[PDB]
């Protein structure tokens, strides 16, 4: 077996689930205990707003929570956490530290890697970012014709794209006085082409986000951008005015035409999917200003300290992680839905698809043994209320159990019509989790059908269709306002949730060996597509698809 | 029990799966049979491009496919299809026809509901759409100060939002000369506020899209837009120059204050999630032109005819449906990933979240029996290569089985860098399904590590992490180019896939009773949010969350 399944606290939990989970009914749990909300929620005061983590609408009793906390302890969560924070090389397959927490370590307490404090270098790069932000935002940094920069274009993939995109989208109201920001990520030529179409080479600055500065899709996009730029500027020395790098590859950066002074460094202990807090967040700082970026870091730091200092039984990321374990390893739920009732947060779910799924979509444990249990879930979701009119039909009346996190700010950034829109938004946020829990009983639906004037025959036929079984569990995460600080705390909270789950599963949340095979095979296919010759080097499907491509690419429609 | 589970062909299939499925190995299937691609793919010639549906990388043999087709016949798929196309009231809980196929019936062969041909009214509304599009796009239609329209704003949610948004995004290259299009859907005031901030009341045309014309989000947004407009125009007669309605509800459209000549009608037999083909598609036609809209309809019509006339064994939507049944009801896969390698198609997956999940997220059958089997899957995805660098780690090396549809056009709309970007995009499209199929054996990974110069200790430690188990099934759907016609065919193909699955499960794909409870409970909560007094009328969680909102809404941040 594996570490988790051999653990006696896990075995006890699974045994309890087998014998008792059918007796867990949300309606009954609330009726039996008026203190349920009080006992199954955390009201966190950050001093910059409150975050309420209400986990009371979950299929758990006091005893279940106790068993879950005991399991976290006996899986080594507390020790593993302290090891991360101290710079221990917990990314064991790559022999690397895991120190996104250092990037936002506002206290500046030394954190050592190989006996050396990383904080001076973290702060040196932050200082460089601040200076660059002043130069660009003030208009002092001039393009090749002497004009101020109006547009920033981040070119990067995965961890170099999703974070900056999600955060600038979420913090749009804080971008007054900032340049417009654009994100190019797909190798699909559509992405860069449609972006460049709306830009002037005179006033556009490109940020090339790549640690190695050899990333294929990113560098291809970067080179396309440079070609477009040079068509107008006709001067290779002008590239330094319009291109900067988030990288450590000084030689390659200089080769590209970028001034090495404008290379913003980060470190091997910064995972791509944990990198927005580093130099990778430069586009955030440019867009909303460095002050707001520091606030984002500070919110994450607050949550880091919460995670570090708080007993497990009232520790927010730990409890979220444990509820996830309960649903994944005991109920067997494949997915986890993130449903923010906030249009600004429209890329939040997509961000945590990488954060969660690339971290914990794993199957080999620390010992090298294959797991004999489930690991990371499929993360998905769309903002409310839109989801209600798209897929909530399935959540309410389908055949899947789907743990959902509902998220909302109390205060809106746009209190139009004396708060009418936000009142309705809040009402829907509250109603949906209430509905998911309560359902609608036959006696309730029957009276509605009778009042609607349905015949006895029609009523009988329609009745089961109108019944909601309910008992569908949710978390509700409510926060004062979606400020840079609060957003930072929320992202960090989920980062640590993912960490806790990874430790409990005995997997490495911080490597990504599963991307290698696709990369290898793509490099082999690339040169085969050129020219008219038949490709026979693969399986018949791959060959057949290539044949179709070669036959169809010249057809005039 | 239910119709599917009681069916002897289904029980035979399930028994076969139990006894034989573990012996299905994709790598070996391809090695043993050079004709595999040829035997498990459909190359459809539409005369306006080809669509290759390659299902050969699925965990199926000839025997499995035979059993699946026999099951479709035993479940009465052909008769049910014919009933849909003939105007029979197959939406049995609402006693309605299901006639999205009539909307795009280019042949104009009569389709009767209640003994009356629907085609004259379908065509009357299309003619009205054509005339209106000509007037607006030409610049002839003037706003209240006498200026041409520059911006179109669709206000609607769910079925009245997702289709037009997805299609205008996918067909962006065909929008040159057309007005800018905006989509407002969320009640969240951010959505309308940020849209209106970028617009002038003088040159903006609002399209209020709602089947019922009573949806709270849509009517509230519409009223907010009207108030903003009238603050500038100060003349109720000016509304007729700036507001049109797409609806079935003439009375409510009139009540809102829109001229009947500004109403584009559709019918009760047009489901919201099947409505883009109707008047609801007005924003598409305005953006890309009515000619391109007609091409979209024509593509759907081609696929409708394919579905209607083709033997099941060679019928694309039927085969896709059956493969889905195989994975859902035999393998127990919760999800289905849609992965278009096309940035323009970035909202395709989101569209089919509604299309699939709202249709087949059901639990009551035609006989009134509760299902004792799985129904509709959770649909999700992001376009390649973006999804590729986010979550494919889990697809390759997690603990979930995830059927994936990979989609790509052979010809790009933007063949920049002499086709370099598209070459890389195609290579990745091909490599990923190859990688998912093939995997990488321990001995293959061992040789790679040996060649890398790894010590025996370092090799043994890393080895298991580098293994890819493979045997992960995919469909590859490749088409000549993403034109309006081909897009129409692709959407219709999935519509019919969803239909076939619904018939086989004995559920109603065309109602949506599961959205009612949330609406009811939100109406009750709305007035409770007003004032500072505590709410005690709900469960303690709902009460506690309301208390938090009331306590936090006045804090300065």
mmCIF file of C-alpha atoms in Angstrom, chain B residues 290-433:
data_model
loop_
_atom_site.group_PDB
_atom_site.id
_atom_site.type_symbol
_atom_site.label_atom_id
_atom_site.label_comp_id
_atom_site.label_asym_id
_atom_site.label_seq_id
_atom_site.Cartn_x
_atom_site.Cartn_y
_atom_site.Cartn_z
ATOM 1 C CA UNK B 290 -26.081 38.175 -41.730
ATOM 2 C CA UNK B 291 -24.391 36.254 -44.574
ATOM 3 C CA UNK B 292 -21.930 34.678 -42.120
ATOM 4 C CA UNK B 293 -24.824 33.957 -39.735
ATOM 5 C CA UNK B 294 -26.583 32.113 -42.582
ATOM 6 C CA UNK B 295 -23.397 30.101 -43.150
ATOM 7 C CA UNK B 296 -23.379 29.173 -39.452
ATOM 8 C CA UNK B 297 -26.994 27.980 -39.762
ATOM 9 C CA UNK B 298 -26.117 26.095 -42.957
ATOM 10 C CA UNK B 299 -23.280 24.240 -41.206
ATOM 11 C CA UNK B 300 -25.642 23.168 -38.447
ATOM 12 C CA UNK B 301 -28.152 22.074 -41.090
ATOM 13 C CA UNK B 302 -25.496 19.914 -42.761
ATOM 14 C CA UNK B 303 -24.800 18.169 -39.445
ATOM 15 C CA UNK B 304 -28.552 17.808 -38.785
ATOM 16 C CA UNK B 305 -28.851 15.967 -42.105
ATOM 17 C CA UNK B 306 -25.813 13.826 -41.239
ATOM 18 C CA UNK B 307 -27.432 12.886 -37.928
ATOM 19 C CA UNK B 308 -30.812 12.188 -39.559
ATOM 20 C CA UNK B 309 -29.711 10.115 -42.558
ATOM 21 C CA UNK B 310 -26.552 8.224 -41.557
ATOM 22 C CA UNK B 311 -26.495 4.617 -40.256
ATOM 23 C CA UNK B 312 -25.649 4.640 -36.534
ATOM 24 C CA UNK B 313 -22.292 2.870 -37.000
ATOM 25 C CA UNK B 314 -21.031 5.781 -39.156
ATOM 26 C CA UNK B 315 -22.990 8.593 -37.485
ATOM 27 C CA UNK B 316 -20.642 11.094 -35.797
ATOM 28 C CA UNK B 317 -22.822 12.462 -32.936
ATOM 29 C CA UNK B 318 -24.086 8.929 -32.220
ATOM 30 C CA UNK B 319 -20.557 7.495 -31.951
ATOM 31 C CA UNK B 320 -19.402 10.363 -29.725
ATOM 32 C CA UNK B 321 -22.444 9.793 -27.500
ATOM 33 C CA UNK B 322 -21.792 6.043 -27.270
ATOM 34 C CA UNK B 323 -18.126 6.504 -26.364
ATOM 35 C CA UNK B 324 -19.345 8.867 -23.653
ATOM 36 C CA UNK B 325 -21.800 6.234 -22.349
ATOM 37 C CA UNK B 326 -18.959 3.687 -22.319
ATOM 38 C CA UNK B 327 -16.813 5.964 -20.118
ATOM 39 C CA UNK B 328 -19.649 7.266 -17.919
ATOM 40 C CA UNK B 329 -21.698 4.106 -17.292
ATOM 41 C CA UNK B 330 -19.008 1.410 -17.541
ATOM 42 C CA UNK B 331 -15.766 3.130 -16.436
ATOM 43 C CA UNK B 332 -17.497 5.612 -14.104
ATOM 44 C CA UNK B 333 -15.694 8.756 -15.331
ATOM 45 C CA UNK B 334 -17.249 11.881 -13.804
ATOM 46 C CA UNK B 335 -15.894 14.371 -16.325
ATOM 47 C CA UNK B 336 -15.404 15.145 -19.997
ATOM 48 C CA UNK B 337 -12.711 17.610 -21.107
ATOM 49 C CA UNK B 338 -13.082 19.796 -24.194
ATOM 50 C CA UNK B 339 -9.681 21.017 -25.367
ATOM 51 C CA UNK B 340 -9.756 23.144 -28.544
ATOM 52 C CA UNK B 341 -6.301 24.112 -29.808
ATOM 53 C CA UNK B 342 -7.618 27.475 -30.889
ATOM 54 C CA UNK B 343 -7.580 30.735 -28.954
ATOM 55 C CA UNK B 344 -10.675 31.981 -30.812
ATOM 56 C CA UNK B 345 -12.496 28.925 -29.366
ATOM 57 C CA UNK B 346 -11.622 29.944 -25.788
ATOM 58 C CA UNK B 347 -15.300 29.958 -24.733
ATOM 59 C CA UNK B 348 -16.285 26.689 -26.473
ATOM 60 C CA UNK B 349 -15.900 24.553 -23.324
ATOM 61 C CA UNK B 350 -17.892 27.056 -21.233
ATOM 62 C CA UNK B 351 -20.695 26.958 -23.803
ATOM 63 C CA UNK B 352 -20.988 23.183 -23.605
ATOM 64 C CA UNK B 353 -20.982 23.343 -19.821
ATOM 65 C CA UNK B 354 -24.516 24.684 -20.191
ATOM 66 C CA UNK B 355 -25.338 22.696 -23.312
ATOM 67 C CA UNK B 356 -24.332 19.365 -21.809
ATOM 68 C CA UNK B 357 -24.745 19.817 -18.044
ATOM 69 C CA UNK B 358 -28.053 21.699 -18.050
ATOM 70 C CA UNK B 359 -29.430 19.172 -20.538
ATOM 71 C CA UNK B 360 -28.297 15.920 -18.965
ATOM 72 C CA UNK B 361 -27.692 16.783 -15.321
ATOM 73 C CA UNK B 362 -30.934 14.975 -14.511
ATOM 74 C CA UNK B 363 -32.115 12.202 -12.215
ATOM 75 C CA UNK B 364 -35.740 11.355 -13.128
ATOM 76 C CA UNK B 365 -36.636 9.215 -16.161
ATOM 77 C CA UNK B 366 -39.590 9.232 -18.568
ATOM 78 C CA UNK B 367 -41.188 6.380 -16.582
ATOM 79 C CA UNK B 368 -40.933 8.448 -13.387
ATOM 80 C CA UNK B 369 -38.203 6.189 -12.021
ATOM 81 C CA UNK B 370 -35.184 7.688 -10.295
ATOM 82 C CA UNK B 371 -32.010 6.799 -12.200
ATOM 83 C CA UNK B 372 -29.882 4.058 -10.633
ATOM 84 C CA UNK B 373 -26.963 4.958 -12.886
ATOM 85 C CA UNK B 374 -24.904 8.008 -13.817
ATOM 86 C CA UNK B 375 -26.205 10.661 -16.193
ATOM 87 C CA UNK B 376 -24.461 13.756 -17.613
ATOM 88 C CA UNK B 377 -20.765 14.387 -16.912
ATOM 89 C CA UNK B 378 -19.039 17.510 -15.640
ATOM 90 C CA UNK B 379 -17.707 19.318 -18.729
ATOM 91 C CA UNK B 380 -14.585 21.479 -18.433
ATOM 92 C CA UNK B 381 -11.467 22.626 -20.273
ATOM 93 C CA UNK B 382 -9.253 25.434 -21.541
ATOM 94 C CA UNK B 383 -7.860 25.933 -25.071
ATOM 95 C CA UNK B 384 -4.478 24.430 -25.964
ATOM 96 C CA UNK B 385 -1.739 25.174 -25.393
ATOM 97 C CA UNK B 386 -2.968 27.187 -22.363
ATOM 98 C CA UNK B 387 -4.730 24.285 -20.657
ATOM 99 C CA UNK B 388 -1.677 22.220 -21.583
ATOM 100 C CA UNK B 389 0.596 24.300 -19.307
ATOM 101 C CA UNK B 390 -1.950 24.426 -16.480
ATOM 102 C CA UNK B 391 -3.499 21.042 -15.715
ATOM 103 C CA UNK B 392 -2.242 18.339 -18.098
ATOM 104 C CA UNK B 393 0.092 17.148 -15.315
ATOM 105 C CA UNK B 394 -3.025 15.658 -13.693
ATOM 106 C CA UNK B 395 -4.326 14.189 -16.957
ATOM 107 C CA UNK B 396 -0.987 12.407 -17.531
ATOM 108 C CA UNK B 397 -0.014 11.421 -13.976
ATOM 109 C CA UNK B 398 -2.998 11.863 -11.649
ATOM 110 C CA UNK B 399 -5.483 9.268 -10.419
ATOM 111 C CA UNK B 400 -8.437 10.262 -12.620
ATOM 112 C CA UNK B 401 -9.634 8.845 -15.917
ATOM 113 C CA UNK B 402 -10.633 11.810 -18.084
ATOM 114 C CA UNK B 403 -11.994 11.323 -21.614
ATOM 115 C CA UNK B 404 -10.755 14.306 -23.665
ATOM 116 C CA UNK B 405 -11.858 15.768 -26.977
ATOM 117 C CA UNK B 406 -8.971 17.543 -28.701
ATOM 118 C CA UNK B 407 -10.097 19.923 -31.492
ATOM 119 C CA UNK B 408 -8.118 21.944 -34.063
ATOM 120 C CA UNK B 409 -8.424 23.622 -37.471
ATOM 121 C CA UNK B 410 -5.819 22.633 -40.069
ATOM 122 C CA UNK B 411 -5.778 26.190 -41.446
ATOM 123 C CA UNK B 412 -5.186 29.088 -39.077
ATOM 124 C CA UNK B 413 -6.837 32.491 -39.438
ATOM 125 C CA UNK B 414 -3.421 34.053 -38.716
ATOM 126 C CA UNK B 415 -0.601 32.222 -40.559
ATOM 127 C CA UNK B 416 2.085 34.528 -39.127
ATOM 128 C CA UNK B 417 5.839 33.801 -39.329
ATOM 129 C CA UNK B 418 5.209 31.719 -42.489
ATOM 130 C CA UNK B 419 3.111 29.272 -40.456
ATOM 131 C CA UNK B 420 5.616 28.756 -37.610
ATOM 132 C CA UNK B 421 3.144 29.305 -34.754
ATOM 133 C CA UNK B 422 0.551 26.962 -36.259
ATOM 134 C CA UNK B 423 3.199 24.308 -36.935
ATOM 135 C CA UNK B 424 4.073 24.297 -33.217
ATOM 136 C CA UNK B 425 0.379 24.346 -32.250
ATOM 137 C CA UNK B 426 -0.397 21.352 -34.497
ATOM 138 C CA UNK B 427 2.670 19.461 -33.229
ATOM 139 C CA UNK B 428 1.455 19.860 -29.636
ATOM 140 C CA UNK B 429 -2.127 18.875 -30.530
ATOM 141 C CA UNK B 430 -0.788 15.649 -32.059
ATOM 142 C CA UNK B 431 1.866 14.918 -29.428
ATOM 143 C CA UNK B 432 -0.445 15.239 -26.454
ATOM 144 C CA UNK B 433 -2.918 12.578 -27.589
#
